[PDB]
Write a protein that binds this DNA or RNA. Structure first.
Lengths: 248, 248
DNA sequence: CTTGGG
DNA sequence: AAG
DNA sequence: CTTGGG
DNA sequence: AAG
């Protein structure tokens, strides 16, 4: 089965991802920026108990680590944690937006290629490491009142809510799949951040290309959702479109 | 004095005007128009007593007459009467707006002409007769509760509040002063509806031209305000501007 | 939580 | 609505 | 009176 | 504010 042929490629069986070929990312600040430390809004016990298992899981995975940082942004007190990084975003140097819009991306699908595989990468941003010099930027406060820990944590991977994460991830995955494209010139591969479409001229080619793509992704350290995958279909849902008979 | 040399030309001494050379005006309706009869809003006794002497004066002057008309528009219940003619205005055919704006009008004043006379015509619109076929358009209701008269009156002269009155008056006065302009080619005459500026190169020429203009206006049936007149001045107020040393 | 078109 |  | 830009 |  697809599940058992590629255990490393699926999030269900391969463990947390880590893009081993990608250098830890340095996040350049704007020329005038200095750290901003926003105090954590008090949060209800109900919210804290809701957030706690997520924090503990991320700590266990090494995705969060303790720190002391002159930067601090709040977690939203109203469960899964959402960090308000707007004041960090304002201080980080802008980058060119290179992710194509879905309409343009799909124009690259020609009618000759009507067998599709759609993969969704799980926890994609967390596969990319942050350089230790950039980790303090994203710190937040975590207090466990009935344990006694009140200090800061920060991210060791590219965080949710950071304005450049989609673009940096898309560019990293493009670097990591550049050789795959070269080895499979008969295949169309569309990338939209963590959403991938592979297109082939036949069922057989789609099957062989999907095997190759899963092998490559797993080896590089990315993880696809086995439960959401649409494998070797003549009709798929991709980026809000239903792709069917070359339409849409 | 200017008052006594031209008794016919001044409103103070010449009586109500009447432009004797101008045919009574016919007011064309739009192609689809039919009469509209708006009921008179009840008006307080205080307002009625305030309006009454004006109505009686206009009746005595023949400017208002009794009628029966399928048209009716209201008098404003909050003193001097103001008729809301907006529903008549909507039904009257539009005419080209030929009154120049003051900025453009004043551009026709050259520096060679620095002696000014400014005249303001009194009750200008009322100098123009309305054709009997057009009089019913402007009817309104007048009730004298402590006398017993409840019927309609209408205007026999061009009314205030009618959308074409400024343009029709300006065009009529232009026709009536066309010969004056021909007889006095050295003079500048600016007309803005009922506000006139005469300009000459010298005090003497301004004096002679003002005598001629007052004689002409009075003979034609128009009346100027003796109290507001600015006669043979090197500086005057005209259309919101102070004219002085060729400036403004 | 704070913030930035009838 | 967005972080 | 009724009406038609933050 | 305008009639």
């Amino acid at each position: 089965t697809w599940l058992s042929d590629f255990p490393q490629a699926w999030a269900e069986t391969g463990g947390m991802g880590l893009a081993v070929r990608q250098a830890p990312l340095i996040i350049p600040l704007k020329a005038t920026s200095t750290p901003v430390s926003i105090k954590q809004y008090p949060m209800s016990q109900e919210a804290r108990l809701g957030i706690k298992p997520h924090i503990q899981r991320l700590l266990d995975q090494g995705i969060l680590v303790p720190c002391q940082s002159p930067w601090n942004t709040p977690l939203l007190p109203v469960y899964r944690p959402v960090q308000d990084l707007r004041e960090v975003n304002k201080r980080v140097e802008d980058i060119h937006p290179t992710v194509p819009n879905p309409y343009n991306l799909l124009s690259g699908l020609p009618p000759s290629h009507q067998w599709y595989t759609v993969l969704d990468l799980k926890d994609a941003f967390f596969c990319l490491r942050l350089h230790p010099t950039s980790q303090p930027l994203f710190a937040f406060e975590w207090r466990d009142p009935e344990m006694g820990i009140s200090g800061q944590l920060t991210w060791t991977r590219l965080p949710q809510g950071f304005k450049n994460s989609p673009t940096l991830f898309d560019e990293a995955l493009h670097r990591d799949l550049a050789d795959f494209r070269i080895q499979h010139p008969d295949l169309i591969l569309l990338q939209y951040v963590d959403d991938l479409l592979l297109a082939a001229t036949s069922e057989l080619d789609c099957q062989q290309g999907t095997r190759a793509l899963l092998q490559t992704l797993g080896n590089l350290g990315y993880r696809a959702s086995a439960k959401k995958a649409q494998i070797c279909q003549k009709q798929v849902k991709y980026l809000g479109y239903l792709l069917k008979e070359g339409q849409r």
